[PDB]
Design a protein around this ligand. Structure first.
Ligand SMILES: Cc1cc2c(cc1C)N(C[C@H](O)[C@H](O)[C@H](O)COP(=O)(O)O)c1[nH]c(=O)[nH]c(=O)c1N2
Ligand SMILES: Cc1cc2c(cc1C)N(C[C@H](O)[C@H](O)[C@H](O)COP(=O)(O)O)c1[nH]c(=O)[nH]c(=O)c1N2
Ligand SMILES: Cc1cc2c(cc1C)N(C[C@H](O)[C@H](O)[C@H](O)COP(=O)(O)O)c1[nH]c(=O)[nH]c(=O)c1N2
Ligand SMILES: Cc1cc2c(cc1C)N(C[C@H](O)[C@H](O)[C@H](O)COP(=O)(O)O)c1[nH]c(=O)[nH]c(=O)c1N2
Lengths: 365, 362, 361, 367
């Protein structure tokens, strides 16, 4: 597996163009694993086109200058209201793998989410973070003791929150991966105890993780870890009520980048109903489709506290390693700064109160 | 000479849409387009497909679900999954084993075979393929009353446990591909010569002046439950039940009949609300994915019926190819059940759907 | 101007395909004059896509067989609920011009509408009609005596209604014709007196038409008057108050005001306002039997056919044009059977399914 | 900074304004052409500006007793030949060698108002020569220094400005991908704002960056008080800003999204107009811009609450193709296009336009 190895900053004009650029340096199978989604990818398109449903207003004479992008979540002060989404197997994108992404995220000044399906060990990632804050995303074992062990190792590494990804009890129908017969070209050291991953398909990896996740799992992870728990993959408001009742300390609105259930809504369309149900009882992280500063703003305006970034950071990693990934984070901060100035937002809380224009015509207008 | 493919093999289905173009490589041009095509410029066939994006499924989490059960029961038949085979004539356009091949797939899978009155096979040939599997017979009514009595008696003696009255084909749809290819039927219809006849003249020999009395007459004569097939307007569901139907079969004939009509799935909720659980509902016209099976049940259907994708599987692999399509739908549905929080088929019928007012382009 | 000249029936699978086929035989300028519309033709596309806003239901066990397409309008018995729209310069499509269309229309058994801008004389058209019914479409002159004279000649020819086309007081912005520098290759003998049109552009007649003109035409001719080009219901009220005997809903095939609605979308509001006081003719975008049915279900009494008939005339002279009329009758017969309509009055009562998603569904 | 704008002067036959874009691309240098034509992001909001016109459709009306429609109107005491004015646009020398004096001559001779951008590549004296006494409004991009604003406003008023336009939607630049990809810089100076920067060799983000970011309602008040001229506030898309501007002493509201050159993933400008017009409630005049390309658009804007529209890109493309005569051709095209529309809609005069029923099209562009 010939992963890219260039380390360089990149001049990001927009994040969309990074996809085709990365396609020229990432091996075909791996690239399509990263870029692809379920079915014919209509719901991935829906994640993107959802942003045109609610439109931002420019606002004038707002007495605003030098907008402050910084915010705080679960005690962590971060440079902008976005974090790194949990993504396994960064080694598909770049030889420096999760340690590269970790270096970008910590240097930038936000929170790194570590996937249980990382191709790097806790020690390797921690070397890249150099003290930076991190949250750990568990894919649950069937065996309780193994979940206890993974959680203890995560916390001992320094995790300050646990993310339970519950929308992948089985694999999505990822036609690119089926057609390419994709299999991992390396191991997953954190979950190996219950599988190695090298040569396995993702459907069999998700297959070893727990299918019968219930609200008791949320309660049990919360009690065992003593850390705030996010429940990730929520698209229906009832699950936010369920998660909060079961002791969750945050809601993570996501459709897994459209890699899971097909013929489902664009994730952004689901956010307002979820935020209304949550009603600020706990923090909300939003993901699945964020590509612009305007998207960050619209998410916050619609009830998110922060967003999580995925594919664009991974494409940045492919093209330039840690410096490429950092270039993408920096882009988002600068992009957001512009949008804050033009929308009349002095600070992150102002973003959360913006009026949005309803566009009933959709993408073709 | 019509020379259909004859190879029997399993196929690895990634999705059923790709089966269309794959099947086009092995089926004679004329026959293929007869199967694939629809009325006018096929806008309503596209509508059947795009309607699925009007109501979107939610993923649901921590639902305490594992190993979802796809089994269900309809009019006392226990079936492996909530889909049956739609009645389609002339399977011989797809594969040399014709309706017997589809029958074997359906029977071995474990669902119900619907036999078209316009099958290219006899009841005896189809029965060999079914090897005892359940079957329903779909009638295209004759003008002559005794002929209807005779066909129904033969169907029932063959083992039919329900009758399907297809009433949306009193004349043929405007099927441009068949006109432009100058296609005509290459073999007979022995249950009802058909060979060398256009479909429009075939439908011409059947009864045009179908009335509610016909539903009453078929039910009384056969002593079997009768489904009325082709329904798109809720008043017809009411009429059919009042006339003695034991089931409603929501369909636009795969968009092969009236043009510039709705996508079938968009018609389902108003029909199910009108039926008000009085009789079972079968839904068809455009089902291609497990997501579609789930959305139809969530919208008031009890089962769906499959058509073109199974024929395309038959073309590619005979009974084994058709079986592969049925298996694909069962596994596809299983995934969807797991991700939506559905442990069983009754759970599918209760799912919330997300309304998408933006339609296909979003 | 090398117009098509051959005469033969044609196979019509659908009318949309006639446009491309006609383009291969009609001279470029004249073809594009017939086919084109204002601006970038968005409103011509809207005329077409409007049919997907309201969708037909198949209906079952309706006790229907051998549907009857026939109807009557102002006492004329016609074979199907469609007439020929008034279109000038049929010579652009075929050497036999309006006499060819007239033969098709009379042989079929409907009403011929004669444009004041016809390339043929009344006598030439009359020999094609062989006694068949005709209505005369006037484009008003500024001079009152010229209007009197034209109406007298039309009535003398046998017109049994007058159609006042009032949506062309100035020309639409027809980019194809501007880009092609289109000019008529022949004269317009009926309106000669006030212009010869050979060498003239269409944009080069009365602009200040008022309701009084409707009154004066009705009073002078003693014939029923249709007011043609209506898209707003207030104009239906105005026209009926002014003595009109019919309302002709139309946007001139999208050749007039640009960035306006598709004609079918305007029909229900106009039919509501008319409230059955007078008959309604609908045009602009009819291409299928389904469209005929939908127009009737939405308040029209008949529709008028235009471009597809002209494309048929290009392809086959009167027999070509006849094939198109026959196509529409057969197409409607299928639709009637499948929708549960025994007769034309049943079409007028059909439920339609609302499609809020539009063309891409 | 090599830059070779076209120089030929000729009338042009305008069939429609859309076609002028491709035609101008043949003769305007690449960077400057794409600076004029382009917009933010992937230009979805520029497309929205254009497709918004299909949301509300015109009715033809019959037997209206209308002939020879009169396009003349009046705004803040200026009698103009048609209900459109020239939008403020800097650096006209990117389009044609004759620069802002070329456009000024066309606008003046046609008989409407010239809006002069603070970022003009021409001095007041050079523009005034082109105007030959014609009416002018001055568009300020504010300095941070109060005295420099007073000086600019004084010079503008001395030159003959009869209104001041505060463009407040560009406190920082939009994300203009074409200009980033092309590394666009201005090839000449901006004499009116040089005092706070020159612009030659500078990127627009750094010129906007020198202008005032922290614009507040007090700036509107101070401009109005200092100049003693009516002040428009330009770039409004949200009705609250119309309330704000009037409360602060504005004499007019200029609805605009800057040609989609500023905030991305925002509504098409025409879609915002009715809510603004409802809030304004005829307290002050409304200028509308961003996407006007046809007489139908002028009509629809007036029917939806605007008093006049402002023209931008199509006039610059005309300038590129023919200098002042090319620009004149574009203005004339608009007057004739509007006249046709007025005849067919039953509109005898500009006030009738403002009263037109519109057909609501909930299907949008694809219908
Ligand atoms: C390649 C790749 C791999 C993974 C993911 C995504 C992608 C793209 N996602 C989902 C991820 O956290 C996030 O929800 C999406 O990346 C957001 O969608 P976009 O990146 O904005 O398109 C994911 N989520 C998770 O909780 N654990 C994981 O290991 C992975 N793996
Ligand atoms: C080739 C072919 C032939 C037939 C049909 C369909 C097709 C595709 N259909 C309609 C069929 O029962 C069912 O309604 C459609 O197949 C459903 O549409 P899809 O297959 O999902 O597109 C049909 N229906 C019926 O009742 N008797 C018949 O003989 C046939 N024949
Ligand atoms: C080439 C051409 C020429 C004319 C027209 C149309 C066309 C296409 N139309 C309008 C005509 O009566 C009718 O309203 C349209 O043809 C209907 O649109 P479709 O033909 O269905 O697209 C027209 N109308 C009229 O009253 N007098 C005329 O002379 C003409 N001329
Ligand atoms: C090349 C160019 C340059 C500028 C502008 C636009 C364009 C296209 N615009 C905005 C302008 O006044 C107006 O809002 C838009 O031109 C209207 O959009 P359309 O031209 O119809 O697309 C602008 N606005 C302003 O107040 N001062 C300026 O200097 C400029 N500069």
């Amino acid at each position: 597996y010939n992963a890219p190895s260039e380390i360089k900053y990149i001049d990001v004009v927009n994040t969309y163009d990074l996809e085709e650029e990365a396609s020229k340096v990432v091996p075909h199978g791996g690239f399509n694993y990263i870029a692809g989604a379920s079915g014919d990818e209509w719901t991935k398109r829906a994640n993107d086109r959802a942003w045109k449903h609610k439109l931002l207003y420019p606002r004038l004479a707002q007495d605003v200058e030098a907008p402050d992008t910084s915010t705080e979540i679960l005690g962590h002060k971060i440079k902008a209201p976005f974090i790194m989404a949990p993504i396994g197997a960064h080694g598909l994108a770049h030889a420096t793998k999760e340690a590269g992404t970790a270096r970008a995220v910590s240097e930038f000044g936000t929170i790194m989410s570590i996937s249980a399906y990382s191709g790097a060990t806790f020690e390797e990632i921690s070397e890249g973070l150099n003290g930076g804050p991190r949250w750990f995303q568990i894919y649950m074992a069937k065996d309780d003791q193994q979940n206890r062990d993974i959680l203890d190792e995560a916390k001992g590494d320094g995790a300050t929150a646990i993310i339970l990804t519950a929308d992948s009890t089985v694999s999505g129908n990822r036609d690119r991966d089926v057609k390419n017969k994709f299999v991992y070209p390396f191991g997953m050291p954190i979950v190996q105890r219950y599988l190695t991953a090298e040569g396995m398909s993702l459907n069999n990896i998700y297959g070893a993780s727990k299918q019968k996740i219930s609200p008791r799992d949320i309660e049990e992870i919360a009690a065992h870890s003593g850390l705030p728990v996010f429940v990730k993959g929520i698209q229906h408001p009832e699950d936010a009520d369920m998660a909060i009742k079961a002791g969750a300390s945050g809601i993570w609105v996501s459709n897994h980048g459209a890699r899971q259930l097909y013929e489902a809504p664009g994730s952004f369309d689901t956010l307002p109903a979820i935020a209304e149900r949550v009603n600020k009882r706990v923090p909300i992280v939003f993901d699945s489709g964020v590509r612009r500063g305007e998207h960050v703003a619209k998410a916050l305006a619609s009830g998110a506290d922060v967003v999580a970034l995925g594919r664009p950071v991974l494409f940045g990693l492919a093209l330039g390693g840690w410096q490429g990934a950092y270039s993408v984070l920096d882009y988002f901060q600068k992009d957001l700064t512009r949008v804050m100035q033009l929308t009349g937002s002095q600070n992150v809380e102002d973003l959360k109160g913006l009026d949005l224009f309803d566009n009933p015509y959709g993408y073709e207008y």
